[PDB]
């Protein structure tokens, strides 16, 4: 799959190459360690690419906004407040075939991240050894791919993404365990984004581009209007935003933040308010 590629603004588990069941874990306000995978937000990391530097910040997703930091001149690493220090940027360089990634410090590219036998991390000069190789797993792909899901608006604990009765228009409706409100989320390798298929009619969540900008269930198409970048909120891994591939500045949105059964769901410019936030759970 290409779902685990080192994309800007994607969120990952970062594992030692020798153990996919251990992940980089922010255990305290400053310390990181490899730990058994638990999928808490303190084990999730957002990549933020700096084009000028051709290097990334690696930000924990537990709400603290702290970033992976080499404690120069020492050999230790920590999470610290982002002060845009050169020691807070990392080159992420991938072996295309093995999928292993080297995490090399920007301030001193002689130094790479290394995991130790005792699960601690440090920086070190480069060897040929597996203790300096990491694998990246996209969190959302791991959790949601090929799963039957419900999508609740942040606006109301009992309002869900639902195909309307006797229409293709997609609306908010209270839960009644309907196949109209159940969506199979499937990653499409060609578009590098997701489709969401309504269980009731086997048609897909799709931006219908006219003055209304409603989403409807629509037949399978190659057009970008049917594909969605599902991401966590910038600093909250408990909520999602769905950006449409036809215009990635536009997102799945509840019309006028209304909560009434039948309220139109639309595609609208991103602003990040609660009517654009979705709680996705497995059925
Ligand atoms: C904060 C908020 O609700 N903004 C909504 C916007 O997201 C979109 O739904 C639009 C539809 O025309 O109406 C606005 O009031």
From Swiss-Prot:
GO terms for cellular component: extracellular region. 2-beta repeats lie at residues 191-236. 1-alpha repeats lie at residues 1-52. The keyword Secreted applies. Residues 9-137, 177-281 form the Ricin B-type lectin domain. It is found in: Secreted. This is Main hemagglutinin component type C. Residues 253-276 are annotated as: Sugar-binding site 2. Arranged in 2 beta-trefoil domains (called 1 and 2) each with three tandemly repeated subdomains (called alpha, beta and gamma) joined by a short alpha-helix. Only subdomains 2-alpha and 2-gamma, in the C-terminal beta-trefoil domain, possess a functional carbohydrate-binding site.
């Amino acid at each position: 799959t290409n779902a685990n590629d080192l994309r800007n603004n994607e969120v990952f588990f970062i594992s030692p190459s020798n153990n996919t069941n251990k992940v980089l874990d922010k255990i305290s306000q400053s310390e990181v360690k490899l730990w058994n995978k638990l999928s808490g937000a303190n084990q999730k990391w957002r990549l933020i690419y700096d084009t000028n530097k051709q290097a990334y910040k690696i930000k924990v997703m537990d709400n603290t906004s702290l970033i992976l930091t080499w404690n120069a001149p020492l050999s230790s690493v920590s999470v610290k407040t982002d002060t845009n220090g050169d020691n807070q940027y990392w080159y992420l360089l991938q072996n295309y075939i093995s999928r292993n990634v080297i995490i090399r410090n920007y301030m001193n590219p002689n130094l790479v991240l290394q995991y130790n036998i005792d699960d601690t991390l440090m920086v070190s000069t480069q060897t040929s050894s597996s203790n300096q190789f990491f694998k990246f797993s996209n969190c959302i792909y791991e959790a949601l791919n090929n799963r039957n899901c419900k999508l609740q608006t942040q606006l109301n604990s009992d309002r869900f993404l639902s195909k309307n009765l006797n229409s293709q228009i997609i609306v908010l409706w209270q839960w009644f365990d309907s196949s109209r409100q159940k969506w199979i989320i499937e990653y499409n390798e060609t578009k590098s984004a997701y489709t969401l298929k309504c269980q009731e009619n086997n048609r897909y969540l799709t931006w219908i581009q006219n003055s209304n900008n409603y989403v409807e269930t629509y037949q399978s198409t190659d057009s970008l209007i049917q594909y969605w970048n599902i991401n966590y909120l910038d600093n909250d891994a408990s909520k999602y935003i769905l950006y449409n591939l036809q215009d990635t500045n536009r997102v799945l949105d509840v019309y006028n933040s209304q909560i009434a059964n039948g309220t139109h769901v639309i595609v609208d410019s991103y602003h990040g308010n609660t009517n654009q936030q979705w709680i996705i759970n497995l059925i």
